[PDB]
């Protein structure tokens, strides 16, 4: 299986509207050698996916969100699972690949009383606390501290991409528009002003907070060549016994 | 051909698809600026990227997407392009399209209204076609209201044929005619019938067209009066009245009957004082007597293939004769070069009521570019989806060589090599119908698929030396995965002691046989053995190719590997149909006796929601049939429409779900049988 | 004409008063008290040291930029200080200004501290009450929430961390103190949640209200996010000294030892 091979298929894989879903099972299928993807818990926590595939003969795991499966936002039992495989992945010197479209977190009370925000620590925990190279693709999503909690760039990330259909922001353009603007009311100006400049990966693109903005059909290469270069990546902590997780 | 010649500047193409592709790569050719519409579904199709221009005309449904008369119209105000090619389908033979589109000043590259109007109506056609001294059916035309009258026509126009009824067929009177006991039995019968029903007594004698072969003469003539006719062809291979694979000479007729027809052809569209192109379609009966059957006045879905025996560019041709251009070829410069073939191939299961459609998104796409004497028309790449609204068609191969033989095995050669995964095609029927007994020596009917087939496909039955040929090379892919999974790097702290096994003794499940083989490795040849049976494959052995070339003791292959578990299941395309193969070793087979077997109950017909949310439209309607991957209804929820798919086809018990209803998860839906 | 020694007095008194006189006026009548308070009350007397006091963030866009909002210090309070002799580093986050949300600045300074507390070897100790991240700042808010949890992440079992909250966290926000080893609230006037009792109605519709999604009483015996709820602000910060005492420093360092009878 040839490194440079392209995917022409991934052009067209995230649709133009933000209201449509896609299999972001697809993505990795065409991305992974040989499209052989050993899938751990495939039937819990379906929001999210992990597992153990190989890239140029290594082996990587893989962390995606699942936008078909309540919208691809994070929860309890996808936090746990993800946090579990993230921890066994850093601690047994394996390399990291994850798929980034989310919105937020569930709602709801049910969420609020059961400790989300434990849980959501143990996910953020496990991918700011990794040591093995880590790389990071934005699809088409990633919106407040979802964005920071998904392995971003300013928790030691490696290397991050955004494909030309994702856009990045505190929160939806809306709320934003609603919440910046009201003590004066606005027709179509704000609104049209706000999502022409902040409806795409402009604002972290000119700010370093993303590598670069790559074509789709060459993700799977440019993945290729970052890990060649990220093997040989050895860092420095401060001495301690055992830190103390959020469980 | 020279460009420099005074052409169009700009081409407005109102089609979508490979025609539009082909009619936009002629313009490249020629010279000409091109512009392209399209849906708002196909913003990336590949004759939206290649045009100059593309102009978005609306929606996805084509009843009204494709034929908004009002949008094109505004779309060549607003490009001021001068001239249209509508290709074939959509607006081609459209009356209103093209008066409209003739109060701009803009050309129409195609016929005049004259000849499509005249050609509509079909009897006001047959009696232009009696004016035009060519032959048609010699059917009877009369009233026959008793017995002795049907005697007296059968001895008038000949009795060998079977019986019309004029108001009535298909058992009105249908008799097998050689002799008058048949007259008097289909006189009595059809007065019978239309008594009851029909309420004319008369009989009819048309002449029999028994075991047909549809014959079709390409005409191309510019508006000076001159005509030329471009040989023949034959489509007689068929389903559902849909052509699947043709060719273009035809081993049934000789130059004289060619001739014949041409001249008969070329009257006929002098008559009408035609203009682009256009076919002539006749029926031939088994003793070489040509009927006229009709004309359409239209640029054909198999025009091409004429083109590779005569090397003609037929697109390219009429654009010139649409500015008045006199053509430049005569009668005498045309000729016959070679043999040709094409094959249509679509996205539909042909083992299920012999093509039904299906849908999906292609996972890859390769074409066999490469091979030689091979062309394809195809309006699709790689990750394209396959819609509900659109025609199902994949690619169109086209194949030429020398003579018959070498076409039909460059065919199959191309018909082995080409890739496409993400959704079910129907390679394996026209692989299997290329290597036909019958089809090979000629004697191809319309009913060809009808009577090889009584039951239905049912794929490619192996004969025991392609069994063999099969399980061999299963074998030695096995062994060449459980060999690579072995090569591991250098560690230089706990080393890797490669196993050695002289030999892998495997039990091999296919279909409802198990087989014992013995496979043994000498680099890159396996030696194997099934059932005392002695075989060695050679091959590359590259495991991540789509492609997997191998030579059997000297025959060469080409097999694809679809699928692989570490269950031992394998899924291999082998002669163009996939062969499901279970492979364990002695260990595991006998181990695997004494396993329980697990009774498994599957449904696929009960819909469940698996989300609560609101469900924003009903898409299906009861009593209706639904494709497999075809969206039912859609359910919104946290501002996410999500489509929930089917499964399977069948019959709607009740529906339990309504538009703009509150459904919660496992909620009933949809019940089939 | 004027000096820079007037500009400097004047930038300092105005660092001091916060926010304004009516906004002090109106913290104090929703139930609680200010963050130099707050400092005052938890550190010995004379021991605080303020560290990187003028501090003006650095926003010209949707005209925020002008002098009418232009706050030094920008909604925190960050420094050094003693507990019964032993040293220690605090922020403490102002509501008055701006509600106290996450700016580059508020979070560049809160960093800063994090880093010389990991340094030197000393616990930390963050007085919570923040209305979330900026809007009007935008992506710069994000990165800022980052930093701080690495640095959370990155100290853990290192020096021991302490989080207080006297108001309505939401937000990110949430997600400091669950990363910190100890977490304690103050009764009636102290929420925690992801998301609001308006989006949790506008989705999943359910009536509820800010106590019963992110009160002390939820947090502390349903949820287990907390470890202790406290009546007041006073009586929160004694027992968060005692607490103090009983905790040492820095792994480095053995449990404590005190005088017995
Ligand atoms: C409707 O009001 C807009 C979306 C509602 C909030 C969505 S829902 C899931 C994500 N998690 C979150 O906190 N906001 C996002």
Known sequence: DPSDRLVPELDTIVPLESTKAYNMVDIIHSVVDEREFFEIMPNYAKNIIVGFARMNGRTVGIVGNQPKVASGCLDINSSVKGARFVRFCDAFNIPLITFVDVPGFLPGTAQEYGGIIRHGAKLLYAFAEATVPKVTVITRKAYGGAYDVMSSKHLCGDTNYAWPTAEIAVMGAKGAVEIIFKGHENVEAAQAEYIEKFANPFPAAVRGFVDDIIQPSSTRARICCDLDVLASKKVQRPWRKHANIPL | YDPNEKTFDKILVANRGEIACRVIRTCKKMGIKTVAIHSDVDASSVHVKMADEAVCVGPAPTSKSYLNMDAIMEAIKKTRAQAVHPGYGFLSENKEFARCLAAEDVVFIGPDTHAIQAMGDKIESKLLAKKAEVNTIPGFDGVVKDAEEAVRIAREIGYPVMIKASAGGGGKGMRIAWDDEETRDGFRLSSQEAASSFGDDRLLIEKFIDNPRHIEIQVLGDKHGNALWLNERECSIQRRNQKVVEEAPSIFLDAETRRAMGEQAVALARAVKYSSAGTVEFLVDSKKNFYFLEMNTRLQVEHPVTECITGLDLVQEMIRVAKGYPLRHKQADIRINGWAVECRVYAEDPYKSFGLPSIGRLSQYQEPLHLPGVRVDSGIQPGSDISIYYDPMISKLITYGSDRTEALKRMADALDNYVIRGVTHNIALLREVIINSRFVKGDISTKFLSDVYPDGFKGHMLTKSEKNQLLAIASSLFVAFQLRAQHFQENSRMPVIKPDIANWELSVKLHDKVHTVVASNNGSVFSVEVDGSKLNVTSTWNLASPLLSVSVDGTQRTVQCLSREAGGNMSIQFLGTVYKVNILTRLAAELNKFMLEKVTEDTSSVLRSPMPGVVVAVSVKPGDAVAEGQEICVIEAMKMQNSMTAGKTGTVKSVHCQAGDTVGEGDLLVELE | ?261
């Open chain 3, 1 to 261: 004409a004027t000096s820079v020694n007037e500009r400097i007095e004047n930038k300092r008194r105005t660092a001091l008063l916060g926010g304004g006189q009516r906004r002090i006026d109106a913290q104090h009548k929703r139930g609680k008290l200010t963050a130099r308070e707050r400092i005052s009350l938890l550190l010995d007397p004379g021991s605080f040291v303020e560290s990187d006091m003028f501090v003006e963030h650095r926003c010209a866009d949707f005209g925020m930029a002008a002098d009418k909002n232009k706050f030094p210090g920008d909604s925190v309070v960050t420094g050094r200080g003693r507990i019964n002799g032993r040293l220690v580093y605090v922020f403490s986050q102002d509501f008055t200004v701006f509600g106290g949300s996450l700016s580059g600045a508020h979070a560049q300074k809160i960093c800063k501290i994090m880093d010389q507390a990991i340094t030197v070897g000393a616990p930390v100790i963050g007085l919570n009450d923040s209305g979330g991240a900026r809007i009007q700042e935008g992506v710069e808010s994000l990165a800022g929430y980052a930093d701080i949890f690495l640095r959370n992440v990155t100290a853990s079992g290192v020096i021991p961390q302490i989080s207080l909250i006297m108001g309505p966290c939401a937000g990110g926000a949430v997600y400091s103190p669950a990363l910190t080893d100890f977490t304690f609230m103050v009764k009636d006037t102290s929420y925690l949640f992801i998301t609001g009792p308006d989006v949790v109605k506008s989705v999943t519709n359910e009536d509820v209200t800010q106590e019963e999604l992110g009160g002390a009483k939820t947090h502390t015996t349903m949820s287990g996010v907390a470890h202790r709820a406290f009546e007041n602000d006073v009586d929160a910060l004694c027992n968060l000294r005692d607490f103090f005492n009983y905790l040492p420093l820095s792994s480095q360092d053995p449990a404590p030892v005190r005088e017995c009878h």
